Amino acid sequence: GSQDVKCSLGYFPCGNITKCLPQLLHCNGVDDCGNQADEDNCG
Numbered sequence: 001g002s003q004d005v006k007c008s009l010g011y012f013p014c015g016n017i018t019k020c021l022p023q024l025l026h027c028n029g030v031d032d033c034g035n036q037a038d039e040d041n042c043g
């Protein structure tokens with residue numbers, strides 16, 4: 001029954017926003033999530 005939960009394999013959610021992007025854009029130094037959550041202290 002749950003819907004829009006987590007992202008499929010090979011993708012990750014920006015956080016509390018409904019959206020998923022490939023690891024390629026993860027900490028890639030590019031604005032995409034909008035809230036800059038993926039670029040938040042990437043380490």
Ligand SMILES: [Ca+2]
Nearest residue numbers: 025027028030
């Ligand atoms: Ca990014």
